[PDB]
């Protein structure tokens, strides 16, 4: 199995952007997807229970499309590295990375 992402994305301050990962070349069951930064959870999509949004992001994260997420009302403080962690059976964990830069043109 391989997890692939855009790698680097840029978006304008105040706008919204979709963060997304694609798991391919595996038939493993996706049971949970965690979206996070290094020291901070954004949101989790659990296959059985639905979406959990972290308190720090409640009013600025829209779940989806699909297993991605839309980060809204971007600030320049959102520039940084994001991770998408797929928990799958039987393969285990796949981890994707996205670097986001929020621009002030």
């Amino acid at each position, epitope marked *: 199995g391989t997890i692939e992402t855009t790698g680097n994305i840029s978006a304008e301050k105040g706008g919204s952007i979709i963060l997304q990962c694609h798991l391919s070349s595996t038939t493993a069951q996706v*049971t*949970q997807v*965690n979206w*996070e930064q*290094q*020291d*901070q*959870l954004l949101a*989790i999509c*659990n*296959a*059985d*229970l*639905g979406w*959990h949004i972290s308190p720090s992001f409640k009013d600025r994260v829209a779940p989806g499309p699909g297993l991605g997420l839309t980060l809204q009302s971007l600030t320049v403080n959102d520039t940084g590295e994001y991770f998408c*962690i797929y*928990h799958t*059976y*039987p*393969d*285990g*964990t796949y981890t994707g990375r996205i670097f986001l830069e929020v621009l002030e043109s």
Partner: antibody
Amino acid sequence: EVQLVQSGAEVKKPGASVKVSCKASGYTFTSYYMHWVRQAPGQGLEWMGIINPSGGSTSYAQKFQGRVTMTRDTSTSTVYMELSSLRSEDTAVYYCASRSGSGWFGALDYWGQGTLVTVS
Amino acid sequence: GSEIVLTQSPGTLSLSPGERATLSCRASQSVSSSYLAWYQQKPGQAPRLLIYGASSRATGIPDRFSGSGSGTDFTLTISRLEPEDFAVYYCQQYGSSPGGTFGQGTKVEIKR
């Protein structure tokens, strides 16, 4: 203070089913998830699954899918866990656990007293 | 299936009151500190939450219990061991599912 009070010990033959319960008291809000976690002799903790506030949604560990059914009596604040096709590896102390919030994510700060289920 | 495995060391600690107890946990893959918990289980009792988010103390838990670590290696420290701390201590990560996975525990024994 939140209290989780579980049903009493059970002895079951191999191949039988067992149904254990836990009543929650002391919550200052209505909606909370409920988990079950078991502890076989000398081993560590093993999460079994979770049920949502209404009882309409559940999630079980892969090894228990097909063998475990949780239900919830919202009117009595009681959760039930039924485990079928009992085998020796199922002898364990079964714990109900929950947490100090309404969502399903986080460590578990509330625990029942345990229910010993012995198979043979 | 491949699950995240937590390996606690040592299996047993035997220390005297007032000493420092250092408990270690190795994770089979790197895990965010937002997902790490420690529990204390005294004999015949249910687990009791001590630490969550790797380093935050649960309500009512005194500062002598502290958690630290990152990536694949985490620790629970009891700064002054007390006789009532006789218990098995479990590490948990709760990031892979609502309940996650647990280590096998470190038994802490108190001398004399």
